[PDB]
Ligand SMILES: O=S(=O)(Nc1cnn(C2CCNCC2)c1)c1cc(Cl)ccc1F
Protein backbone atom coordinates (compact mmCIF):
# COMPACT_ATOMS: atom_id res chain seq x y z
CA UNK A 1 0.00 0.00 0.00
CA UNK A 2 0.96 3.68 -0.31
CA UNK A 3 0.90 6.43 2.33
CA UNK A 4 -1.15 9.61 1.92
CA UNK A 5 -1.46 10.69 -1.71
CA UNK A 6 1.30 8.29 -2.81
CA UNK A 7 3.96 10.92 -3.54
CA UNK A 8 6.47 8.93 -1.46
CA UNK A 9 5.61 5.50 -2.90
CA UNK A 10 8.74 3.69 -4.08
CA UNK A 11 7.35 0.19 -4.62
CA UNK A 12 7.83 -1.89 -7.75
CA UNK A 13 4.20 -2.33 -8.85
CA UNK A 14 3.68 -1.43 -12.51
CA UNK A 15 0.11 -2.38 -13.42
CA UNK A 16 -2.90 -0.10 -13.86
CA UNK A 17 -6.44 -0.45 -12.48
CA UNK A 18 -7.64 -1.86 -15.82
CA UNK A 19 -4.76 -4.37 -15.99
CA UNK A 20 -2.70 -2.33 -18.43
CA UNK A 21 1.07 -2.10 -18.15
CA UNK A 22 2.91 1.05 -17.12
CA UNK A 23 5.10 2.70 -19.73
CA UNK A 24 8.65 3.38 -18.55
CA UNK A 25 9.17 6.98 -17.42
CA UNK A 26 12.27 7.40 -19.60
CA UNK A 27 10.43 6.06 -22.67
CA UNK A 28 8.60 8.21 -25.19
CA UNK A 29 6.73 5.18 -26.57
CA UNK A 30 3.79 5.03 -26.95
CA UNK A 31 3.34 8.34 -25.10
CA UNK A 32 5.60 11.29 -25.62
CA UNK A 33 5.59 13.00 -22.29
CA UNK A 34 7.80 15.23 -20.00
CA UNK A 35 7.55 13.41 -16.62
CA UNK A 36 10.93 11.84 -17.18
CA UNK A 37 13.66 11.00 -14.70
CA UNK A 38 15.75 13.46 -16.73
CA UNK A 39 13.33 16.24 -15.84
CA UNK A 40 12.44 14.97 -12.40
CA UNK A 41 15.55 13.20 -11.06
CA UNK A 42 14.29 12.95 -7.49
CA UNK A 43 10.81 11.46 -7.85
CA UNK A 44 11.90 7.80 -8.17
CA UNK A 45 10.98 7.53 -11.85
CA UNK A 46 12.76 4.18 -12.19
CA UNK A 47 11.87 1.76 -14.97
CA UNK A 48 8.05 1.69 -15.28
CA UNK A 49 7.14 1.69 -11.59
CA UNK A 50 3.89 3.27 -10.40
CA UNK A 51 4.64 6.73 -9.03
CA UNK A 52 2.93 9.91 -7.96
CA UNK A 53 5.45 12.58 -8.98
CA UNK A 54 2.93 15.37 -9.63
CA UNK A 55 0.86 15.48 -6.42
CA UNK A 56 -2.01 13.47 -7.83
CA UNK A 57 -3.97 11.38 -5.35
CA UNK A 58 -2.34 8.04 -5.86
CA UNK A 59 0.42 6.39 -7.84
CA UNK A 60 -0.13 6.31 -11.56
CA UNK A 61 1.74 5.77 -14.80
CA UNK A 62 1.57 6.36 -18.50
CA UNK A 63 0.16 3.22 -20.11
CA UNK A 64 1.51 0.96 -22.84
CA UNK A 65 -1.85 1.39 -24.61
CA UNK A 66 -1.44 4.22 -27.18
CA UNK A 67 -5.13 5.10 -26.65
CA UNK A 68 -4.83 5.66 -22.88
CA UNK A 69 -2.21 8.20 -21.87
CA UNK A 70 -2.26 7.45 -18.16
CA UNK A 71 -4.04 5.52 -15.43
CA UNK A 72 -3.92 5.08 -11.68
CA UNK A 73 -2.24 1.92 -10.52
CA UNK A 74 -4.01 -0.97 -8.81
CA UNK A 75 -2.85 -0.01 -5.32
CA UNK A 76 -4.55 0.79 -2.02
CA UNK A 77 -3.77 3.62 0.42
CA UNK A 78 -2.45 2.34 3.78
O1 LIG B 1 4.01 14.76 -19.77
S1 LIG B 1 2.93 15.00 -18.83
O2 LIG B 1 3.11 14.74 -17.41
N1 LIG B 1 1.52 14.27 -19.43
C1 LIG B 1 0.40 14.12 -18.60
C2 LIG B 1 -0.92 14.41 -19.00
N2 LIG B 1 -1.79 14.18 -18.01
N3 LIG B 1 -1.01 13.75 -17.01
C3 LIG B 1 -1.65 13.41 -15.75
C4 LIG B 1 -0.91 12.32 -15.01
C5 LIG B 1 -1.59 12.07 -13.69
N4 LIG B 1 -1.59 13.29 -12.90
C6 LIG B 1 -2.41 14.29 -13.58
C7 LIG B 1 -1.75 14.65 -14.90
C8 LIG B 1 0.32 13.69 -17.30
C9 LIG B 1 2.53 16.72 -18.98
C10 LIG B 1 2.39 17.50 -17.85
C11 LIG B 1 2.08 18.83 -18.02
CL1 LIG B 1 1.89 19.86 -16.65
C12 LIG B 1 1.90 19.37 -19.28
C13 LIG B 1 2.04 18.58 -20.40
C14 LIG B 1 2.36 17.25 -20.24
F1 LIG B 1 2.50 16.47 -21.32
Ligand SMILES: [Cl-]
Pocket residue numbers: 001002003006008009010
Ligand atom coordinates in the same frame (compact mmCIF):
# COMPACT_ATOMS: atom_id res chain seq x y z
CL1 LIG C 1 4.23 5.27 0.31
